[PDB]
Design an enzyme around this catalytic site. Structure first.
Site, PDB file in Angstrom:
ATOM      1  N   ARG A  96      -9.059  -0.103   4.612  1.00  0.00           N
ATOM      2  CA  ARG A  96      -8.803   0.166   3.202  1.00  0.00           C
ATOM      3  C   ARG A  96      -9.519  -0.779   2.267  1.00  0.00           C
ATOM      4  O   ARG A  96      -9.890  -0.360   1.164  1.00  0.00           O
ATOM      5  CB  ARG A  96      -7.300   0.077   2.892  1.00  0.00           C
ATOM      6  CG  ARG A  96      -6.440   1.147   3.562  1.00  0.00           C
ATOM      7  CD  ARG A  96      -6.882   2.562   3.190  1.00  0.00           C
ATOM      8  NE  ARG A  96      -5.913   3.586   3.605  1.00  0.00           N
ATOM      9  CZ  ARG A  96      -4.881   3.981   2.849  1.00  0.00           C
ATOM     10  NH1 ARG A  96      -4.689   3.436   1.654  1.00  0.00           N
ATOM     11  NH2 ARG A  96      -4.033   4.904   3.295  1.00  0.00           N
ATOM     12  N   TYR A 110      -2.444 -10.329   4.578  1.00  0.00           N
ATOM     13  CA  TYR A 110      -2.387  -8.928   4.972  1.00  0.00           C
ATOM     14  C   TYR A 110      -3.822  -8.429   5.139  1.00  0.00           C
ATOM     15  O   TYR A 110      -4.590  -8.385   4.184  1.00  0.00           O
ATOM     16  CB  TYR A 110      -1.598  -8.149   3.930  1.00  0.00           C
ATOM     17  CG  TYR A 110      -1.569  -6.641   4.007  1.00  0.00           C
ATOM     18  CD1 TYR A 110      -1.878  -5.946   5.179  1.00  0.00           C
ATOM     19  CD2 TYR A 110      -1.248  -5.904   2.869  1.00  0.00           C
ATOM     20  CE1 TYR A 110      -1.845  -4.548   5.208  1.00  0.00           C
ATOM     21  CE2 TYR A 110      -1.204  -4.536   2.882  1.00  0.00           C
ATOM     22  CZ  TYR A 110      -1.520  -3.858   4.042  1.00  0.00           C
ATOM     23  OH  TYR A 110      -1.486  -2.486   4.023  1.00  0.00           O
ATOM     24  N   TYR A 153     -12.484  -3.665  -2.294  1.00  0.00           N
ATOM     25  CA  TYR A 153     -13.639  -3.210  -3.094  1.00  0.00           C
ATOM     26  C   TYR A 153     -14.705  -4.289  -3.336  1.00  0.00           C
ATOM     27  O   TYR A 153     -15.896  -4.002  -3.148  1.00  0.00           O
ATOM     28  CB  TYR A 153     -13.165  -2.594  -4.423  1.00  0.00           C
ATOM     29  CG  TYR A 153     -14.272  -2.019  -5.308  1.00  0.00           C
ATOM     30  CD1 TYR A 153     -15.149  -1.051  -4.830  1.00  0.00           C
ATOM     31  CD2 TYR A 153     -14.389  -2.425  -6.632  1.00  0.00           C
ATOM     32  CE1 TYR A 153     -16.167  -0.547  -5.655  1.00  0.00           C
ATOM     33  CE2 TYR A 153     -15.387  -1.913  -7.457  1.00  0.00           C
ATOM     34  CZ  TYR A 153     -16.267  -0.984  -6.962  1.00  0.00           C
ATOM     35  OH  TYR A 153     -17.249  -0.471  -7.805  1.00  0.00           O
ATOM     36  N   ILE A 172       5.927  -4.589   9.513  1.00  0.00           N
ATOM     37  CA  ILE A 172       6.054  -4.064   8.157  1.00  0.00           C
ATOM     38  C   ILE A 172       5.642  -2.605   8.274  1.00  0.00           C
ATOM     39  O   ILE A 172       4.452  -2.282   8.411  1.00  0.00           O
ATOM     40  CB  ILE A 172       5.210  -4.837   7.142  1.00  0.00           C
ATOM     41  CG1 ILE A 172       5.845  -6.232   6.891  1.00  0.00           C
ATOM     42  CG2 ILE A 172       5.140  -4.068   5.802  1.00  0.00           C
ATOM     43  CD1 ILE A 172       4.935  -7.243   6.259  1.00  0.00           C
ATOM     44  N   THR A 180       0.833  -1.203   0.000  1.00  0.00           N
ATOM     45  CA  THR A 180       0.000   0.000   0.000  1.00  0.00           C
ATOM     46  C   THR A 180       0.869   1.255   0.000  1.00  0.00           C
ATOM     47  O   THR A 180       0.632   2.213  -0.754  1.00  0.00           O
ATOM     48  CB  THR A 180      -0.905   0.000   1.236  1.00  0.00           C
ATOM     49  OG1 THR A 180      -1.406  -1.333   1.448  1.00  0.00           O
ATOM     50  CG2 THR A 180      -2.095   0.962   1.021  1.00  0.00           C
ATOM     51  N   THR A 181       1.902   1.256   0.845  1.00  0.00           N
ATOM     52  CA  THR A 181       2.764   2.424   0.994  1.00  0.00           C
ATOM     53  C   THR A 181       3.512   2.728  -0.301  1.00  0.00           C
ATOM     54  O   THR A 181       3.912   3.882  -0.536  1.00  0.00           O
ATOM     55  CB  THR A 181       3.755   2.177   2.139  1.00  0.00           C
ATOM     56  OG1 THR A 181       3.026   1.840   3.326  1.00  0.00           O
ATOM     57  CG2 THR A 181       4.610   3.410   2.414  1.00  0.00           C
ATOM     58  N   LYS A 211       0.040  -9.957   8.293  1.00  0.00           N
ATOM     59  CA  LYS A 211       0.323  -8.561   8.596  1.00  0.00           C
ATOM     60  C   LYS A 211      -1.020  -7.943   9.033  1.00  0.00           C
ATOM     61  O   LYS A 211      -1.963  -7.859   8.242  1.00  0.00           O
ATOM     62  CB  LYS A 211       0.892  -7.778   7.387  1.00  0.00           C
ATOM     63  CG  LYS A 211       1.033  -6.263   7.629  1.00  0.00           C
ATOM     64  CD  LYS A 211       1.434  -5.608   6.313  1.00  0.00           C
ATOM     65  CE  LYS A 211       1.520  -4.065   6.356  1.00  0.00           C
ATOM     66  NZ  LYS A 211       1.670  -3.500   5.023  1.00  0.00           N
TER      67      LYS A 211
END
Ligand SMILES: N[C@@H](CCCC[NH3+])C(=O)O
Ligand SMILES: N[C@@H](CCCC[NH3+])C(=O)O
Ligand SMILES: [Mg+2]
Ligand SMILES: [Mg+2]
Ligand SMILES: [Mg+2]
Lengths: 296, 296
Positions: A140, A135, A109, A205, A45-46, A164
């Site tokens: 999100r 994860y 989504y 992470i 994501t980052t 994660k």
């Protein structure tokens, strides 16, 4: 199981004139290696995985693999997708191009059911022979991998080795490790790195480690040695920056801080991400003054 | 502003042996046309946009356009993405291939700021000259297009004409139309179609209309004609099916119901979506029995 644990960084992806700045990317990875980081995560994501093309996702993984050769540092490649056929394709690419493992975000989504998440990750895990870290980031994605689904996947799939967690839910962290103590619980939420590690989590992470890799590495290794006083002290010291780096959606604040620190050339995002407000820019700058930031 | 309003259907995408069943898709659209629907929405959320390729997304739009040609029925093409460069590409394709407008979901997973959402949609709206309907569904995307951002986009961009709201928030519906009564507010939540229309909303983009297109189009047309008594009566009659179609994530229940009704050949999804539980399969079948389902 084979595992990837310890202090790990969700790498930012720097852009120059809209393209991935590949030299900057390799340089930033070298800085993480030199400051005690155990593994790097390209294109999570980052790293703005959403706005990279599949080709660029693959390029960033290759740069990370090449930069880490000859070191102990592992590459846990970002390979997730909300479409199982896409996630399988990225997983296979990461395996064939020398990643040590993959990070695979829960589908965003389209909100699969727990049965669908089980089949999604089983298909990914059966497609490679390298470790797979789940994860969970429900704020999100719009979905949650339940504790029961994580435990079933860990037990049923040889290469799924942990999760994660970016859900702000320490009760779930207790639930996970009380019923399945063999999995690797990884903090995906910097502010609560120490509580997750002190309950038996085995790594992080991190977003903050892009900026302060030495502090996050020290926190994690103190905690893994049960030096909890030292690990908590760093976690407490980092709280203010850990929170300001989410004053707008990650990675807007962390890229802003990396730019303010002189570690990237341009403060560029791909739309729909963009620069922070002027007020938050000032807030980020102010909090940074309390920390020593390593150069190159 | 040019607009697309009225009773509209978020078309399911039928699969056969893993591929889009293009003949079934055309047949399903003709059935919508025969039952009073004003527009169809190919490849929205209900159409499994996440797991289609870009090429399949384009193929479905083409089929819709062609099937509707020479009828009153418009095509509002699903063209959203969480990457602005992808969203612009899909918008341009829809325009060049004869869609009457586009539906464009707020970016999912990467959580743009309000500034980022404004720039995202401004970029899309400037790339085509056909109407653009915003689409807010925070439970799936992880972000919310605020009332202020929607109104600014409506006022600043010529072709942005309204929003499909799927947020369960009638207060926001009042906020929108009290401050900007010129926009077209579209219900994206079947259970509350009548309350949205009775506050001045001008259409629906429906899941339930896949199964019961005559009932949803009647509901919408009664309301636009100010027969609130009859619109409310249908909305109330439909509540049980409107809710059971979300007993698992949409479109799992609606595809199950279409299969149970004999309207599609096979109950196939693309992972990570999958068949419902046996319990929910039975619940959907039981609720369906109370409604008259039109054939072909
Ligand atoms: N924008 C799409 C495609 C990304 C492909 C590269 N990671 C998504 O977020 O799934
Ligand atoms: N799975 C990606 C790509 C979809 C491309 C076709 N609509 C996404 O959901 O953004
Ligand atoms: Mg089992
Ligand atoms: Mg740079
Ligand atoms: Mg009509």
């Amino acid at each position: 199981k084979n595992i990837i644990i310890g202090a790990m960084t969700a790498l930012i992806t720097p852009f120059k004139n809209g393209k991935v700045d590949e030299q900057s990317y390799a340089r930033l990875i070298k800085r993480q290696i030199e400051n005690g980081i155990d593994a790097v995560v390209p294109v999570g994501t980052t790293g703005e995985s959403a706005t990279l093309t599949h080709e660029e996702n693959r390029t960033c993984i290759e740069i990370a693999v090449e930069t880490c050769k000859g070191t102990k540092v592992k590459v846990l490649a970002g390979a997730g997708s909300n479409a199982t056929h896409e996630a399988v394709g990225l997983a296979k690419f990461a395996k064939e191009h020398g990643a040590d493992g993959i990070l695979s975000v829960a589908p965003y989504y389209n909100k699969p059911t727990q049965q669908g998440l089980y089949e999604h990750y089983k298909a990914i895990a059966q497609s490679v022979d390298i470790p797979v870290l789940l994860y969970n980031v429900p704020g999100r994605t719009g979905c949650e991998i339940s504790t029961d689904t994580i435990i079933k996947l860990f037990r049923d799939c040889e290469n799924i080795y942990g999760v994660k967690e970016a859900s702000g839910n320490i009760d779930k962290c207790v639930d996970l490790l009380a019923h399945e103590p063999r999995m690797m619980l990884i903090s995906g939420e910097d502010a609560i790195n120490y509580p997750i590690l002190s309950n038996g989590g085995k790594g992080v992470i991190s977003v903050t480690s892009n900026l302060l890799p030495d502090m996050i590495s020290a926190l994690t290794h103190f905690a893994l040695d049960e030096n909890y006083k030292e690990a908590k002290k760093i976690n407490d010291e980092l709280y203010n920056i850990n929170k300001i780096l989410f004053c707008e959606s990650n990675p807007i604040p962390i890229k802003t801080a990396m730019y303010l620190a002189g570690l990237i050339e341009s403060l560029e995002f791909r739309l729909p991400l963009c620069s922070p407000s002027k007020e938050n820019f000032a807030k980020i700058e102010e909090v940074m003054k309390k920390y020593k930031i390593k150069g190159f």
